Design a protein around this ligand. Structure first.
Ligand SMILES: Nc1ncnc2c1ncn2[C@@H]1O[C@H](COP(=O)(O)OP(=O)(O)CP(=O)(O)O)[C@@H](O)[C@H]1O
Ligand SMILES: [Mg+2]
Ligand SMILES: [Mg+2]
Ligand SMILES: [Mg+2]
Length: 441
C-alpha cells in the first residue's frame, strides 16, 4: 500500500492535475485572528476569500493543512488515546473552490479520487455518505449522479439541538463562512463497535468520517443570522491519517506507517515494553502538536496559547512517567518525528535545536515536582471515598506541583475517578481574590 507521504502527495497531485493551485499549509498560529486559538481546518487561510473580501489569482486551490484541535470550538485532547480517529495534531487534505465549481463537481472529484481504479480504488460498498437534511440537491447528486443506494445515504438535520447546529452544517467559528456539508464515511468492519451516522452509536470507530465536503453558502454573524456569501463556494477536508488507515488496511490512525514508527521511537526512549498502550499513543500524538507548535513560534507559558502548549507537554511527560521513563525523553522524539513527516517535516528540521531545547527545558522544569505530585495524588486517591476527587486537592496539585487540572483529571480518569472541576475553579478564583485583596489592584 501507499505510505502516508505518498498519499499526501497523491491527493495534492490529483487536484493539481484537475486545475487546482497547490498552496502551502498555513501556520498553526492564526495570522490575524485573536479569537481562534490554533488553526483547526484547511479553510482558515482562505477565510477572507470565501467571504469575498480577499481575491486570489486562482479560483481553485488544494492544500495539506496542519491542524491542532486542543481548544475552543474543536477540542480533541480528551479523545487522544481513547478513539481510533482523533489526534491533537493532524493534517487535513483539502480542495477549495472560490466561486468556481459547486456541488456536483465537488462530489465527483471526491468520488473519483476515492473509488477510481486510476486513483485510490476503494470499494464502493464500504462507503457511506451523509447530507444536510434540507440539502435535496446533494442528496439527488449522490443518488442519481453517483448511484449510491438510498440505504447508504443518510440525511442529518439539526442534531446538536439548535438551528444550524448539525454534523452536516459546518462552521469553524461563531462567525465566518459556513454551510451545509456532505460527508463520506468508511465502514471498517463489524468487529468494531459503532453504528452508521444518525444513530446513538455513531460515535463508535466502525463508521469513520473520512472526507467532509462543505458547500460554503453563508457568513454567520454575531446575531447568529446567516448572511449569504457573494459566491457559493466549496471547502473540503479529509484527514490524512484517517484515509491512510483505510488505504493501509488498518482500522486505527495509530496503526498507519507514520505512527507505527513514531510509537516505536516512543517505546525506545521511554523503555516501554508494550508495543502499544494509551500512553505510547498519547505521547506519539503530543510530540506532533508540541514540536510543530513550537516550530510555528509558540512558546510555553502560563497564559493563552502558551499554556495549552505547556499543558500538552506536561501531559506527555506524565504519560512518559507511567511508561517508566528514567531520563528526560520527550525532546528526543523530535528527530524521529522530523523523519516520519517527510516533506512536511522540513520546517521543523530547520528549527530542530530550538524545539528540542524548549521541550528539554520544559520537561526538566516539570520533573522537579512531577513524581512528588503523583505521590500526593496517589495518597489522596487512596483515602478518597466516592468517585470524585475534590477540587481542593486538584488546586493543591496545580498550585504547588504545577499540575494543570486536566492533567490531574487525566490521571484520575484512568482509575475511574472524576475531578470536581467547579471546586477547582472556585479555588482558583478565591486565590485571585486574595491576590487582589493583598496587592490592591
Ligand atoms: N482530531 C482529529 N484527528 C484526526 N482527523 C480529524 C480530526 N478532526 C477532524 N479530522 C478529519 O478532518 C476532516 C474535516 O474536519 P471536520 O471538522 O469535518 O471533522 P469532524 O470533527 O466532523 C470529525 P469527527 O466527527 O470524527 O470528530 C474530518 O472528516 C476528519 O477526516
Ligand atoms: Mg470532531
Ligand atoms: Mg464529524
Ligand atoms: Mg465533519
Amino acid at each position: 500500500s501507499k505510505s502516508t507521504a505518498e498519499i499526501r502527495q497523491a491527493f495534492l497531485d490529483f487536484f493539481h492535475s484537475k486545475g487546482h493551485q497547490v498552496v502551502a499549509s498555513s501556520s498553526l498560529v492564526p495570522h490575524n485572528d485573536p479569537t481562534l486559538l490554533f488553526t483547526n481546518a484547511g479553510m482558515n487561510q482562505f477565510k477572507d476569500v470565501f467571504l469575498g473580501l480577499d481575491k486570489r489569482n486562482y479560483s481553485r486551490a488544494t492544500t495539506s493543512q496542519r491542524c491542532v484541535r486542543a481548544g475552543g470550538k474543536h477540542n480533541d485532547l480528551e479523545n487522544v488515546g481513547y478513539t481510533a480517529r482523533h489526534h491533537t495534531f493532524f493534517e487535513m487534505l483539502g480542495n477549495f473552490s472560490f466561486g468556481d465549481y459547486f456541488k456536483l463537481d465537488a462530489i465527483l472529484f471526491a468520488w473519483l479520487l476515492l473509488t477510481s481504479e486510476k486513483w485510490f480504488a476503494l470499494p464502493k460498498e464500504r462507503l457511506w455518505v451523509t447530507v444536510y437534511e434540507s440539502d435535496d440537491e446533494a442528496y439527488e447528486i449522490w443518488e442519481k449522479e453517483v448511484g449510491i443506494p438510498r440505504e447508504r445515504i443518510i440525511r442529518i438535520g439539526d442534531n446538536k439541538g439548535a438551528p444550524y447546529a448539525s454534523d452536516n452544517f459546518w462552521q469553524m467559528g461563531d462567525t465566518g463562512p459556513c454551510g451545509p456539508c456532505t460527508e463520506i464515511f468508511y465502514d471498517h468492519g463489524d468487529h468494531i463497535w459503532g453504528g452508521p451516522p444518525g444513530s446513538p452509536e455513531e460515535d463508535g470507530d466502525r463508521y469513520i468520517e473520512i472526507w467532509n465536503i462543505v458547500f460554503m453558502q453563508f457568513n454567520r454573524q454575531a446575531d447568529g443570522t446567516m448572511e449569504p456569501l457573494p459566491k457559493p463556494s466549496v471547502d473540503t477536508g479529509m484527514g490524512l491519517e484517517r484515509i491512510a488507515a483505510v488505504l493501509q488496511h488498518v482500522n486505527s490512525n495509530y496503526d498507519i506507517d507514520l505512527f507505527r514508527t513514531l510509537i516505536q521511537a516512543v517505546a525506545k526512549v521511554t523503555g516501554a515494553t508494550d508495543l502499544s498502550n494509551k500512553s505510547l499513543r498519547v505521547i506519539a500524538d503530543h510530540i506532533r502538536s508540541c514540536a510543530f507548535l513550537i516550530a510555528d513560534g509558540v512558546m510555553p507559558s502560563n497564559e493563552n496559547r502558551g499554556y495549552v502548549l505547556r499543558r500538552i507537554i506536561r501531559r506527555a511527560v506524565r504519560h512518559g512517567n507511567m511508561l517508566g521513563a528514567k531520563e528526560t525523553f520527550f525532546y528526543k522524539l523530535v528527530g524521529p518525528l522530523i523523519d516520519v513527516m517527510g516533506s512536511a517535516g522540513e520546517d521543523l528540521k530547520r528549527q530542530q535545536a530550538q524545539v528540542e531545547q524548549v521541550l528539554k527545558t520544559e520537561e526538566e522544569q516539570f520533573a522537579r515536582t512531577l513524581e512528588r505530585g503523583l505521590a500526593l495524588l496517589d495518597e489522596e486517591l487512596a483515602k478518597l471515598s466516592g468517585d470524585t476527587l475534590d477540587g481542593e486537592t486538584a488546586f493543591r496539585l496545580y498550585d504547588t506541583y504545577g499540575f494543570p487540572v486536566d492533567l490531574t483529571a487525566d490521571v484520575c480518569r484512568e482509575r475511574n475517578i472524576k475531578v470536581d472541576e467547579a471546586g477547582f475553579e472556585a479555588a482558583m478564583e478565591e486565590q485571585r481574590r486574595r491576590a487582589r485583596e493583598a496587592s490592591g489592584f
